[PDB]
């Protein structure tokens, strides 16, 4: 049914003026982030470049995936909730209230500074059977592909951010009550440059 | 026949942006019967994965630990050469034409005047053989992967990232090491 909270994004500013060029020039892990909340506009923009639709007809998206199974879900973690982005409506539906930035830190405490972390969830059951490695191996490259979407962005948008493995996937998969055919690949703490 | 094809510097001043190129970006299996310029295979190399920072020797695609394990193969009509990023070069490892084993049973891929494959040294993480550094290598190979369909998309060129390939094929033609394995591949041209 309806989550308890929606977040409405705005339409993806395709206007934005980074050339990928420069961006690849730029494109770099940083660790460090500024306290202050994400704008609208940018988070918005940051969630359609991840794996936003770029195809209304196909309902086809920004990152390719093996057999076109759109197997990653980006969860956002903010320090109100924690939300799933729905890419068909362009919106944010919240899966828990409260803070599960510590979550994602898994023991790496600049984490919990940046505003929003975006972790690349595979669910591996949309190839088939969650337990093939093979499957499993598809959904990292499909992460991947997602966390280099979030990089160029990034780079181009001037927000600092760094592709991450380490988390606590055990914390991650109660507080975000996901299956265990989804499985937690890769995660991108963002924030303004500090 | 050449052994080192020399590429041009990489050109930062190309005009398509970040946001349109996410916009165009798509999976195309057809291409023009033309070859990349030279300029083209440049750019589109350093994109993949050059040194973006001359200083600490990192790359344009981030990498688990910094090991940069992703090294990228160029496979074209004339031969099969690796990128070599430190001097933004290619390095002849076979003559001849072997898309037909970056095709692997797909033959739409021979019709692309260039195949990069993307190979993950997997010892870099250690054991070649433990999962996590198997999936270390994947993920770091599709990072490699959207670089190459991004700078597509922004400098009009076709590609399609594939798992799909003779990677038995591949593993003698390109002389691997048994910890490389060949993770994804792109076929790239000029649209049709
Ligand atoms: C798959 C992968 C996993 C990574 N995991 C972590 C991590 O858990 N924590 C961290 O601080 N950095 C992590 N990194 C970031 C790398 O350390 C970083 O990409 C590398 O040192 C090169 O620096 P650069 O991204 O600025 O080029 C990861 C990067 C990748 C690609
Ligand atoms: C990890 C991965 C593996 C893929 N392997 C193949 C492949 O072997 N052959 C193929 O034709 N396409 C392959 N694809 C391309 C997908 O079919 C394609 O991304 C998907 O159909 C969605 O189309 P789009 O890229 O235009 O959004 C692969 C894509 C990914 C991400």
């Given at each position: 049914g309806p989550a308890d909270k929606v977040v409405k994004l705005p339409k993806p500013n395709l206007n934005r003026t980074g050339t990928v060029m420069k961006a690849l020039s730029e494109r770099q892990s940083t660790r460090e982030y500024a306290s202050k909340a994400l704008t609208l506009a940018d988070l918005s923009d940051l969630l359609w470049a991840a794996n936003?639709?770029?195809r209304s007809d196909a309902g086809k998206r920004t990152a390719p995936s093996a057999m076109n199974k759109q197997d990653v879900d980006v969860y956002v973690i903010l320090s109100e909730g924690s939300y799933l982005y729905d890419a068909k409506n362009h919106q944010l539906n919240l899966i828990?209230?409260?803070?599960?930035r510590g979550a994602v830190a898994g023991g790496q405490a600049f984490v919990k500074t940046a505003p929003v972390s975006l972790v690349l969830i595979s669910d591996v059951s949309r190839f088939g059977d969650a337990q093939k490695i093979q499957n499993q191996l598809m959904g990292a490259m499909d992460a991947g592909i997602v966390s280099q979407n979030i990089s160029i962005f990034c780079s181009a948008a001037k927000l600092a951010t760094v592709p991450r493995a380490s988390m606590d996937a055990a914390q991650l998969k109660k507080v975000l009550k996901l299956k265990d055919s989804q499985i937690p690949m890769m995660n991108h703490p963002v924030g303004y440059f500090k």
């Amino acid at each position: 049914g309806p989550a308890d909270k929606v977040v409405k994004l705005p339409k993806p500013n395709l206007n934005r003026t980074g050339t990928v060029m420069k961006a690849l020039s730029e494109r770099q892990s940083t660790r460090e982030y500024a306290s202050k909340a994400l704008t609208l506009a940018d988070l918005s923009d940051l969630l359609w470049a991840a794996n936003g639709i770029n195809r209304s007809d196909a309902g086809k998206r920004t990152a390719p995936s093996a057999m076109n199974k759109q197997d990653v879900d980006v969860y956002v973690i903010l320090s109100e909730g924690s939300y799933l982005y729905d890419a068909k409506n362009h919106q944010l539906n919240l899966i828990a209230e409260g803070d599960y930035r510590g979550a994602v830190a898994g023991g790496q405490a600049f984490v919990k500074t940046a505003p929003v972390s975006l972790v690349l969830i595979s669910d591996v059951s949309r190839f088939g059977d969650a337990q093939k490695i093979q499957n499993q191996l598809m959904g990292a490259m499909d992460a991947g592909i997602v966390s280099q979407n979030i990089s160029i962005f990034c780079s181009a948008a001037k927000l600092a951010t760094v592709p991450r493995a380490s988390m606590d996937a055990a914390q991650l998969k109660k507080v975000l009550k996901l299956k265990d055919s989804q499985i937690p690949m890769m995660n991108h703490p963002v924030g303004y440059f500090k």
